[model samples]
Target: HHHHFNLPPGNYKKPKLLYCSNGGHFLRILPDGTVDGTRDRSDQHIQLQLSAESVGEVYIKSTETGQYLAMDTDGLLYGSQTPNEECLFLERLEENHYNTYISKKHAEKNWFVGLKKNGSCKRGPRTHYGQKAILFLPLPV
Candidate 1:
């Protein structure tokens, strides 16, 4: 569970995203602005990239194809969107390395299905690639 501040209309809300071992994600605000836990996924990395408190119908897309594949930081209201947004759609080429799609649009999509070498996996627990870092855009409010 984590709390962050945005702007007006939606104030500071303590939304707790829980990763249960059984694989479930949940978030709900308490009376005290404290969010509750309802998701179960072990060692899962989930992030709220947008300013919005809750996300729904969030889609992971191949920047090239414009088709949505499960991606990290891709959140939908449904708790069972995907087991691993980062690795699910990405092909594991090597340990901590992956091949994934990078860009997409309503008409065409361009996939950067190349070697996302070490630390290039969904979230960089290993290292940062700077400009080479796979970019995922947050939907505008």
Candidate 2:
């Protein structure tokens, strides 16, 4: 006779992608906090750092500059030092297994990371979960 035992759920490590929804560009977080997108793959891709406070909370870091993606009090996005409340993001799951990062600083205000028509990061109040705001396409490892 064969017997099996089930183990308890373990901590999971999610994969992070560096792709943009608009035009399918590659997303990068610059040192100045500029979120630019491109077609070529480079070191500018972002790394998602999970937060200990919560499972959905995360911190985005630039692989090139080693800077963390942060949002100012005025809802402006930028890259900076260690993760803080301004640099925290909540990975909101969306359709097709994609995720949208809603800024923790502005969650109460319904703000999220939106993109300009030019494929640049534009932070503002959530108007719609359009293509720009839903750019969390994971690049294959």
Candidate 3:
């Protein structure tokens, strides 16, 4: 699955980590798409696994700070509030288990989880698909 972390419009100033989903594998989403090794390199990218509907037990965490805010990713905005709704970013359904974050479907529509691109000394494209550089998300474990 894909993990999308939508952030408030801001430049990535410090180390930051954004995930596509609680249970999604790492996807390096920049203006230029590449693959991030967060999963292979760090345990911080993985969080406690919680029960889910579509997937078995899913993993997730609340941002250390609450600056993170989510917007509508799907054509339809707002977290689903209906009980037993199988969707990402839903309202309170369980303790600390609300469908809060936007899904990949929503991401393509309204949200973009962008981070600061640290341009290497040899700038151009550091990624195979012409990505300028890579971003590191420093999420607090």
Candidate 4:
């Protein structure tokens, strides 16, 4: 059985905006095959599809580019054309009512998906659970 954590029960067939806590930026997968954050919530790149992965994990991909949101060996978030173990993330809702996505492949390293104040990717080694940039609210697009 999956851990499930604090995530709501559901399969995400519909796309949603991952509203980042870094001053209202939303996660986006750019056509350039890079990941970042944006404020124009309606942009297609800001929309994402989440598929159930292993027990408590999920896979995040872009609605526009069809690329999986993946983290490289160094924790840099990028868009991968194919889904892999690097694309899986452990989803957990926080006490702040926001959600944090931990790298399934690097959970022991405590790598959280994060965005900087400028909306750039915050590398894995530079992240932690309590960062504002790591917190997100899955908002309907």
Candidate 5:
């Protein structure tokens, strides 16, 4: 009970898009392992696959590029062709109904998945749970 988590509505079943609360942008993954946000919800590159491995741990993959979302020790986000510890993230639902993705690989350091105010990606070192830049809502695809 203590270790359980509130799974996202379509957890592990379907592809969903992530909308950053601060930037009004949708998260997207690129073929070259780039991470960015777009204003277009209809952008196919925005569709992401979230697969839970255990309680709060999940792997995020992009449908368009078939790449896994990975963060390095330096807190940089990129896509990797292979899944590894670097790609694991902790999915947590916040009180404001937004979700924060922390790097399970560096959870102790609290590196979160975040977007800049301008809709660009935020480095993990520059992110935190309380920041609106790191808050995202899941939109059904």
Candidate 6:
């Protein structure tokens, strides 16, 4: 299927809270570069700082791990100690006002960070308008 990607306009230079829509699981970038989701939202793994790298692209870094979020050519999402092209992500806003982070290197594959039934994070093909994609939720007050 041919997908028309309408990247959102403008740049975001702030941090965001990413969580799974299904169970509100927090997305975390482990020290070993693995991505996962957990109920414990307080962990630093769940905190992401989105820095604008371009109009439609941003560099995502884990506030906790002090690493950048990256995806391998094989569609494996991980945390990298150094920021590079692999660490850049295209932030696409869904129709539901939620956002899906597509790897700038693998945007053609429609790969985005998705949550498994167990709440673990995985790099998967884009679902129905990315219904299972990460949602920017509010932080705990």
- TM-score on alpha carbons, each prediction: 0.18, 0.73, 0.23, 0.91, 0.91, 0.80
Error of 5 at 141 (Å): 1.1
Task: Give the Å shift of residue 16 in candidate 2.
Answer: 3.4
Which segments of model 6 are wrong by more than 4 Å?
A: 1-13, 125-130, 134-141
Give lDDT: candidate 3, residue 55.
32
Encode model 1's per-residue lDDT on 48-133: one tens digit a residue.
22112133112332222223232223221122232333322221122133212221221022222121223212222322223232
Kindly indicate the candidate among 2 and 6 with the higher TM-score.
6
What range of 10 consecutive residues in model 3 has the weakest lDDT sum?
A: 119-128
Model 4 RMSD in Å is: 2.3
lDDT per residue, candidate 6, 6-121, as tens digits? 66543445565676776678778888888878888567677888788876678878877789988887777788999988888777766646667777777677677677658766
lDDT of each: 0.24, 0.60, 0.27, 0.84, 0.84, 0.70
Q: Show where candidate 2 strays beyond 4 Å.
A: 1-15, 43-53, 130-132
Tens digits of per-residue lDDT, candidate 3, 79-141, equal 222222223331111122222233333433322222223211111121111121222233423
Among all windows of 10 consecutive residues in model 4, the one with the lowest summed lDDT is 1-10
Q: Is candidate 2 or candidate 5 better by lDDT?
A: 5
Worst 10 residues of 1 by lDDT: 99-108
With candidate 1 superimposed using the best TM-score fit, by how many Å does residue 49's alpha carbon deviate from the native?
14
Question: Against the correct fold, how does model 3 do in TM-score?
Answer: 0.23
Give the TM-score (vs. native) of candidate 6.
Answer: 0.80
User: Residue-wise lDDT of candidate 5 within 28-88, one digit each (tens)?
Assistant: 8888788899998778789999988887888999988889999987899999999999999
